[PDB]
Design a protein around this ligand. Structure first.
Ligand SMILES: CN(CC(=O)O)C(=O)c1ccc2[nH][nH]c(=O)[n+]2c1
Length: 167
């Protein structure tokens, strides 16, 4: 038993809710919140901008130190950093950005990072400003992640379409 509430169960291990991941994180304090990161951990907009703003920019400060030490992530890769006031940990995961021409097949590799964590609160990778089809992203999620994932979908209209079209 865990503290996530109001989720629709899609599969044995994947759940989905129309929610703001920031507000969801501040209420649940999950062990892991996933950020839709880029390779530079520059949290300017989308989910990343929103999560970082909710940390009063502490996420960005920590991220800049991480990059200064380690260099950029790989597309499809991840790193674990602090969750600040939102979660114990933040798993920063880089899905391919279609608006940068990155290969969509890397989306499966991105979701594989979730399997290193038993339970996660997450957005749909490569959705929103990353330019992928959220229905495809949901399919890859279900077909790749084996651990327990709670997907927060900000847009109610999109949440309805994702549910209604789910196979
Ligand atoms: C795919 N999407 C949008 C969605 O879930 O429909 C996201 O990843 C997302 C979630 C929350 C959020 N707050 N501000 C944002 O830009 N933003 C973006």
């Amino acid at each position: 038993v865990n503290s996530f509430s109001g989720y629709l169960k899609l599969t044995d291990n994947v759940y989905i809710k129309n929610a703001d991941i920031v507000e969801e994180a501040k209420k649940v304090k999950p062990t892991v919140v996933v950020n839709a990161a880029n390779v530079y951990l520059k949290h300017g907009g989308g989910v990343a901008g929103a999560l970082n703003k909710a940390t009063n920019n502490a996420m960005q400060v920590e991220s800049d130190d991480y990059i200064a030490t380690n260099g950029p992530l790989k597309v499809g890769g991840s790193c674990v950093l602090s969750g600040h006031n939102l979660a114990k940990h933040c798993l920063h995961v880089v899905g391919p950005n279609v608006n940068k021409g990155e290969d969509i097949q890397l989306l499966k590799s991105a979701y594989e990072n979730f399997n290193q964590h038993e339970v996660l609160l997450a957005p749909l990778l490569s959705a929103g400003i990353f330019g992928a089809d959220p229905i495809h992203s949901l399919r890859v999620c279900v077909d790749t992640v084996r651990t327990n994932v709670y997907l927060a979908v900000f847009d109610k209209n999109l949440y309805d379409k994702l549910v209604s079209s789910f196979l």
